[PDB]
Amino acid sequence: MTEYKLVVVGAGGVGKSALTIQLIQNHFVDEYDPTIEDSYRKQVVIDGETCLLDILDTAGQEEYSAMRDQYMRTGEGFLCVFAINNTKSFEDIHQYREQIKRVKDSDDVPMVLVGNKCDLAARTVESRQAQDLARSYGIPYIETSAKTRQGVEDAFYTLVREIRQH
């Protein structure tokens, strides 16, 4: 089957890891061992066509700034994640995208803008502004909840579709 190498990028300190973790978990399965191959590789069925998702989420390693190009190079599709309650994580998106474009030497790289929500704090980035930003890049926008798993699949499956239709 086809193997898609996905990479997650975004500001640290706002829980971006919840994205990839929630995907790779089942109902009542709140256990997680970031060492097994099953922790970052999942096989799914998207639009009838079954495939394998390989997800790189270097969360916790943000200070290793000079290591971003290396990590980014490994993927063929990207999830630019920001926190709906942290404006700075939103404003950081533009630079991450410029970096992805530069490493893959291309103006149109399969990527999607994902806005993650944490039920604790207040929203400071309205859907419209994230919607407008996504349209200026010509990529899809997908909001997700870290507490209810709502939107998580859609986020990843959408990126896969962006790769296929490329």
Binding site: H27, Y141, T144, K147, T148, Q150, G151
Partner: protein, 439 residues
């Protein structure tokens, strides 16, 4: 009978401070969450309709976690004998509610792992040796959650573009009948995918709309996308002759929409026609045949008097069909915002259930129209074309809207300014193959 001391139950007797009924089963108007849940699990009779309505609209006056707790508190009945016509049936109704909950509203459990846990722990708390065997049916549902037409559907119609030639696909290259057909399939699927949990509680209007109503917004965004693509096709067709040809296919596509009972697609075109950039193109509509002007006028009249005719026509037809969703949205929002969340009686706070029932009826009507599928052949490539349309490009709403309008002024300047001529854009025949199918 003789229930418990009230200091250990739902034993509080009905009063004007408990429940109010609507003026064979009594219809509830309002009541305490306690009395509401009592009637939802009434010992006298079963109320499958009240259970269907309550599980669809309760989250606005009770949280899922609180509901499970109240249900459990309702099940664990203490003895004061004749409690075989009270304890046996009440426990039964409680479990039928749990079944309905897990069956038709599993999203509540997908969103809260602990809610499911408490449910699995509760299910496993059932004592009755006979009840366990019956309760196994409920457990099976939980584990699970983790049409020949008369005649063969009509042949896929083709025009200038040949099957497979994606590059060539466009508004005048594809067959007008097939355009309306594929947009109807796309629009029908989009319509059939909306869940009541995306509408209840006016959820698509709040800050978390992208999260809670992803299917609804995906449907509305398609409608918007097409209305705009029609405008762009018209307005960017600078040559008057070609533009008249473009406005003509669109009216033709409207005709097939009407035939296919695709109201979303009807108002899609009507909206483009009444948009600012297209509405004032007097030189274009001048050369549009009479019959087509009447088809369009007949279409525009559906909106008049607050959709009086559209609402009438929807009722008069036999599905499949794609209703216009907007009206339902406005009715749910206004029903919820225009009626109180609580009725006050003798200083006590009773939940207005009637309001929730009114929401459920609109929701119900929506779901009814999601049954019947279209007897139409899907054309994967044409479907992908309309699925990937992006009239706006990278422009924001206003920037794009302004572009369309400035384009309209350029192709048909205001009165004292003479109508200039523009070069031909299309290098293929502009004659429509017509709206009548091959055979």
């Amino acid at each position: 009978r003789l229930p418990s001391a009230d200091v250990y139950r739902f034993a509080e007797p009905d009063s004007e401070e408990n429940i109010i009924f609507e003026e064979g089963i009594p219809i509830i108007k309002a009541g305490t969450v306690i009395k509401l849940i009592e009637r939802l699990t009434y010992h006298m009779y079963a109320d499958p309709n009240f259970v269907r309505t309550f599980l669809t609209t309760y989250r606005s006056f009770c949280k899922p976690q609180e509901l499970l707790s109240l249900i459990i508190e309702r099940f664990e009945i203490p003895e004061p004998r004749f409690r075989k016509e009270y304890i046996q049936p009440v426990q039964l109704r409680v479990l039928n509610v749990c079944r309905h909950w897990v069956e038709h509203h599993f999203y509540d459990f997908e969103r809260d792992a602990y809610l499911l846990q408490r449910m699995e722990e509760f299910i496993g708390t059932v004592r009755g040796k006979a009840m366990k065997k019956w309760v196994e049916s409920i457990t099976k549902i939980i584990q699970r959650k983790k049409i020949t037409f008369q005649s063969s559907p009509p042949t896929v119609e083709w025009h200038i573009s040949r099957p497979g030639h994606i590059e060539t696909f466009d508004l005048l290259t594809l067959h007008p009948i097939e355009i309306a057909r594929q947009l109807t399939l796309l629009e029908s699927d989009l319509y059939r995918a909306v869940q009541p949990s995306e509408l209840v509680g006016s959820v698509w209007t709040k800050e978390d709309k992208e999260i809670n109503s992803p299917n609804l917004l995906k449907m509305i965004r398609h409608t918007t996308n097409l209305t705009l693509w029609f405008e762009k096709c018209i307005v960017e067709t600078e040559n008057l002759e070609e533009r008249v040809a473009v406005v003509s296919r669109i009216i033709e596509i409207l005709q097939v929409f009407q035939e296919l009972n695709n109201f979303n697609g009807v108002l899609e075109v009507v909206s483009a026609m009444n948009s600012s950039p297209v509405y004032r193109l007097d030189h274009t509509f001048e050369q549009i045949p009479s019959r087509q002007k009447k088809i369009l006028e007949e279409a525009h009249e559906l909106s008049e008097d607050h959709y009086k005719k559209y609402l009438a026509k929807l009722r008069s037809i036999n599905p499949p069909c794609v209703p216009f969703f907007g009206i339902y949205l406005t009715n749910i929002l206004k029903t919820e915002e225009g009626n109180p969340e609580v009725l006050k009686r003798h200083g006590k706070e009773l939940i207005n259930f009637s309001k929730r029932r009114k929401v459920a009826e609109i929701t119900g009507e929506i779901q009814q129209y999601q049954n019947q599928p279209y007897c139409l052949r899907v054309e994967s490539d044409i479907k992908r074309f309309f699925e990937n349309l992006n009239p706006m490009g990278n422009s924001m709403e206003k920037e794009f809207t302004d572009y369309l309008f400035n384009k309209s002024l350029e192709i048909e300047p205001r009165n004292p300014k003479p109508l200039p001529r523009f070069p031909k854009k299309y290098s293929y025949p502009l004659k429509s193959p017509g709206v009548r199918p091959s055979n």
